[PDB]
Scaffold this active site. Structure first.
Site, PDB file in Angstrom:
ATOM      1  N   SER A  29       0.850  -1.496   0.136  1.00  0.00           N
ATOM      2  CA  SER A  29       0.297  -0.102  -0.046  1.00  0.00           C
ATOM      3  C   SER A  29       0.689   1.210   0.436  1.00  0.00           C
ATOM      4  O   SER A  29       2.192   0.816   0.254  1.00  0.00           O
ATOM      5  CB  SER A  29      -0.919  -0.021   1.389  1.00  0.00           C
ATOM      6  OG  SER A  29      -1.689  -1.325   1.061  1.00  0.00           O
ATOM      7  N   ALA A  31       0.405   5.640  -1.605  1.00  0.00           N
ATOM      8  CA  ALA A  31      -0.537   6.899  -1.747  1.00  0.00           C
ATOM      9  C   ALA A  31      -1.252   6.361  -3.219  1.00  0.00           C
ATOM     10  O   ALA A  31      -2.366   7.385  -3.036  1.00  0.00           O
ATOM     11  CB  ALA A  31       0.403   8.412  -2.420  1.00  0.00           C
ATOM     12  N   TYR A  32      -0.585   5.751  -3.811  1.00  0.00           N
ATOM     13  CA  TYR A  32      -1.165   5.188  -4.919  1.00  0.00           C
ATOM     14  C   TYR A  32      -2.204   4.263  -5.040  1.00  0.00           C
ATOM     15  O   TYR A  32      -3.445   3.995  -4.992  1.00  0.00           O
ATOM     16  CB  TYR A  32      -0.432   4.402  -5.805  1.00  0.00           C
ATOM     17  CG  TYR A  32       0.907   3.171  -5.137  1.00  0.00           C
ATOM     18  CD1 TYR A  32       0.075   2.083  -5.594  1.00  0.00           C
ATOM     19  CD2 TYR A  32       1.711   3.140  -3.875  1.00  0.00           C
ATOM     20  CE1 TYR A  32      -0.115   0.919  -4.410  1.00  0.00           C
ATOM     21  CE2 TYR A  32       2.625   1.976  -3.682  1.00  0.00           C
ATOM     22  CZ  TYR A  32       1.686   0.572  -3.459  1.00  0.00           C
ATOM     23  OH  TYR A  32       2.020  -0.470  -2.492  1.00  0.00           O
ATOM     24  N   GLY A  33      -2.546   3.801  -3.823  1.00  0.00           N
ATOM     25  CA  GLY A  33      -4.013   3.101  -3.101  1.00  0.00           C
ATOM     26  C   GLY A  33      -3.240   1.635  -2.271  1.00  0.00           C
ATOM     27  O   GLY A  33      -2.308   1.399  -1.729  1.00  0.00           O
ATOM     28  N   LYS A  50      -5.676  -3.070  -8.126  1.00  0.00           N
ATOM     29  CA  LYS A  50      -5.613  -2.058  -7.627  1.00  0.00           C
ATOM     30  C   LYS A  50      -6.628  -1.935  -7.411  1.00  0.00           C
ATOM     31  O   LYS A  50      -6.980  -0.573  -7.865  1.00  0.00           O
ATOM     32  CB  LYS A  50      -4.057  -1.239  -9.170  1.00  0.00           C
ATOM     33  CG  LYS A  50      -3.494   0.086  -7.617  1.00  0.00           C
ATOM     34  CD  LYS A  50      -3.690   1.069  -8.482  1.00  0.00           C
ATOM     35  CE  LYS A  50      -2.631   0.543  -9.761  1.00  0.00           C
ATOM     36  NZ  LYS A  50      -1.592   1.880 -10.251  1.00  0.00           N
ATOM     37  N   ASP A 165       3.009   1.767 -15.335  1.00  0.00           N
ATOM     38  CA  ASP A 165       3.345   2.208 -14.152  1.00  0.00           C
ATOM     39  C   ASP A 165       4.029   3.636 -15.732  1.00  0.00           C
ATOM     40  O   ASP A 165       4.413   4.075 -15.166  1.00  0.00           O
ATOM     41  CB  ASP A 165       4.551   2.726 -13.185  1.00  0.00           C
ATOM     42  CG  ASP A 165       3.790   1.849 -12.255  1.00  0.00           C
ATOM     43  OD1 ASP A 165       4.562   1.800 -10.891  1.00  0.00           O
ATOM     44  OD2 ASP A 165       2.488   1.541 -11.961  1.00  0.00           O
TER      45      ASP A 165
HETATM   46  C1  LIG Z   1       5.139   3.222  -8.226  1.00  0.00           C
HETATM   47  C2  LIG Z   1       4.879   2.031  -7.079  1.00  0.00           C
HETATM   48  C3  LIG Z   1       4.780   3.287  -6.344  1.00  0.00           C
HETATM   49  N1  LIG Z   1       3.813   0.617  -7.735  1.00  0.00           N
HETATM   50  C4  LIG Z   1       4.865  -0.550  -8.124  1.00  0.00           C
HETATM   51  C5  LIG Z   1       4.246  -1.394  -9.015  1.00  0.00           C
HETATM   52  C6  LIG Z   1       2.553  -1.312  -7.969  1.00  0.00           C
HETATM   53  C7  LIG Z   1       2.514  -2.523  -9.125  1.00  0.00           C
HETATM   54  C8  LIG Z   1       1.384  -2.648  -9.657  1.00  0.00           C
HETATM   55  C9  LIG Z   1       0.089  -3.323 -10.319  1.00  0.00           C
HETATM   56  C10 LIG Z   1      -0.419  -2.766 -11.144  1.00  0.00           C
HETATM   57  C11 LIG Z   1      -0.826  -2.156 -12.372  1.00  0.00           C
HETATM   58  C12 LIG Z   1      -2.072  -1.399 -12.834  1.00  0.00           C
HETATM   59  C13 LIG Z   1      -2.728  -2.124 -12.790  1.00  0.00           C
HETATM   60  F1  LIG Z   1      -3.988  -1.864 -13.787  1.00  0.00           F
HETATM   61  C14 LIG Z   1      -3.175  -2.831 -11.578  1.00  0.00           C
HETATM   62  C15 LIG Z   1      -1.990  -3.725 -10.988  1.00  0.00           C
HETATM   63 CL1  LIG Z   1      -2.523  -4.492  -9.622  1.00  0.00          CL
HETATM   64  C16 LIG Z   1       1.262  -4.505 -10.728  1.00  0.00           C
HETATM   65  C17 LIG Z   1       2.360  -4.607  -9.965  1.00  0.00           C
HETATM   66  C18 LIG Z   1       2.721  -3.683  -9.370  1.00  0.00           C
HETATM   67  N2  LIG Z   1       3.425  -6.267  -9.866  1.00  0.00           N
HETATM   68  C19 LIG Z   1       4.096  -6.775  -9.306  1.00  0.00           C
HETATM   69  C20 LIG Z   1       5.172  -6.463  -9.191  1.00  0.00           C
HETATM   70 CL2  LIG Z   1       5.356  -5.426 -10.428  1.00  0.00          CL
HETATM   71  C21 LIG Z   1       5.988  -6.678  -8.888  1.00  0.00           C
HETATM   72  C22 LIG Z   1       5.524  -7.396  -7.050  1.00  0.00           C
HETATM   73  C23 LIG Z   1       4.730  -7.589  -6.896  1.00  0.00           C
HETATM   74  C24 LIG Z   1       3.255  -6.927  -7.803  1.00  0.00           C
HETATM   75 CL3  LIG Z   1       2.286  -7.386  -7.310  1.00  0.00          CL
HETATM   76  C25 LIG Z   1       2.495  -7.055 -11.187  1.00  0.00           C
HETATM   77  O1  LIG Z   1       3.028  -8.716 -11.071  1.00  0.00           O
HETATM   78  N3  LIG Z   1       1.242  -7.008 -11.639  1.00  0.00           N
HETATM   79  C26 LIG Z   1       0.422  -5.078 -11.345  1.00  0.00           C
HETATM   80  C27 LIG Z   1       2.076  -0.288  -7.881  1.00  0.00           C
HETATM   81  C28 LIG Z   1       2.712   0.465  -6.739  1.00  0.00           C
END
Ligand SMILES: CC(C)N1CCC(c2cc(-c3ccc(F)cc3Cl)c3c(c2)N(c2c(Cl)cccc2Cl)C(=O)NC3)CC1
Length: 349
Positions: A29, A31-33, A50, A165
């Site tokens: 979790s 600020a992004y959600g 997310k 992202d």
């Molecule tokens: C920059 C920071 C603030 N940000 C980093 C990325 C995070 C993030 C977001 C999203 C995402 C993107 C779009 C969407 F519509 C829905 C979702 Cl859930 C995913 C992941 C991670 N990962 C992931 C990774 Cl890459 C590494 C480990 C664990 C996981 Cl779960 C996936 O595997 N799939 C989707 C969110 C926070």
């Protein structure tokens, strides 16, 4: 055809999701959600969900929510994170205040897995090929990622890659200050605001990523903006007359000209022992003048990717209408547009 929703609390957040999604487990979790992993019993896919945090709390945040949903709904490509599903437990616009975004669970990013490690040439070929394949698609829709770096490359245990992202910016000054990965992959023209930037900024970033995969070392690990510029110019040479003219910022142009001129280095002597085709491609990506950089479409056809390239399996996108970016609407107008996008969603075949 509204599914049945069920509720659960995960690290102090309530998740209300369709019954199809099972085995929810928090991943993080901020600020992004909030993000959880789950299993989609309908498709048999492992998914990441997310939950957006306060998505309509201000005009800026409401527009940001709309922007992200629009971008994610547009992207339909193997090497780009897109939407498997989007839902809200709300039954009307009036009670609409939560947005859930579902995509593939990859489970790691490239930074978390290979930081500080030198990868094999074949491994680098596969990883960069996928990045460029996704970029060809994104750029064909006239979308610019703007923030490509290892941590924005989602990767699974088979080194399959999806870009995430992106098209969303928008970093604070503090976040770009000092010895930080947030800035190391940025094209100089965007780092220092030299001119109106375009999609060619992303190719610079790919150059920086590729170099690091080949060597195990950050290419331009600057301690600040100016130190980073000095690192960059040492490798690629100081700007010539042609590029100086294109620097529309008078202050930036004035500063660049204070620097002692330096010629471009020999990349074969920098990347000692690398595949000569990798060296050639790096020279074509890491060109100071953005007009002269190789494009994603061109790079796919480069001999370095001979084992992976297939011109019949490198698709382009539909055009992406971002005219909304030019509009100043009220919160409720952004919220209604977002609601329309949630309810009009059609899942992949
Ligand atoms: C920059 C920071 C603030 N940000 C980093 C990325 C995070 C993030 C977001 C999203 C995402 C993107 C779009 C969407 F519509 C829905 C979702 Cl859930 C995913 C992941 C991670 N990962 C992931 C990774 Cl890459 C590494 C480990 C664990 C996981 Cl779960 C996936 O595997 N799939 C989707 C969110 C926070």
């Amino acid at each position: 055809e509204r599914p049945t929703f069920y509720r659960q609390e995960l690290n102090k957040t309530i998740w209300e999701v369709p019954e199809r999604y099972q085995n929810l487990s928090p991943v993080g979790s901020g600020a992004y959600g909030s993000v959880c992993a789950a299993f989609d019993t309908k498709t048999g896919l492992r998914v990441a969900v997310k939950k957006l945090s306060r998505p309509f709390q201000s005009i800026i945040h409401a527009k940001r929510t709309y922007r992200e949903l629009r971008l994610l709904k547009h992207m339909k490509h193997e090497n780009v994170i897109g939407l498997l599903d989007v839902f809200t437990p709300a039954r009307s616009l009036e009670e609409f205040n939560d947005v859930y975004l579902v995509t593939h669970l990859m489970g790691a990013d490239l930074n978390n897995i290979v930081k500080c490690q030198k990868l094999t040439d074949d491994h680098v070929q596969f990883l960069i090929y996928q990045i460029l394949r996704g970029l060809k698609y994104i750029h064909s829709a006239d979308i610019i990622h703007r923030d490509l770096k290892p941590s924005n490359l989602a990767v699974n245990e088979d080194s399959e890659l999806k870009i995430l992202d992106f098209g969303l910016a928008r970093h604070t000054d503090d976040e770009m200050t000092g010895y930080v990965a947030t800035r190391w992959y940025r094209a100089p023209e965007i780092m220092l605001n030299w001119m109106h930037y375009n999609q060619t900024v992303d190719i610079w970033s790919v150059g920086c990523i590729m170099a690091e995969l080949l060597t195990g070392r950050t290419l331009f690990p600057g301690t600040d903006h100016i130190d980073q510029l000095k690192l960059i110019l040492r490798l690629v040479g100081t700007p010539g007359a042609e590029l100086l003219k294109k620097i529309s910022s008078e202050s930036a142009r004035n500063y660049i000209q204070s620097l002692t001129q330096m010629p471009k280095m020999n990349f074969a002597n920098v990347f000692i022992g690398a595949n000569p085709l990798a060296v050639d491609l790096l020279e074509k990506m890491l060109v100071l003048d953005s007009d002269k950089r190789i494009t994603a479409a061109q790079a796919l056809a480069h001999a370095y990717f001979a084992q992976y390239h297939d011109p019949d399996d490198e698709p382009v996108a539909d055009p992406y209408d971002q005219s909304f970016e030019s509009r100043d609407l009220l919160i409720d107008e952004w919220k209604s547009l977002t609601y329309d996008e949630v309810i009009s969603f059609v899942p992949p075949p």
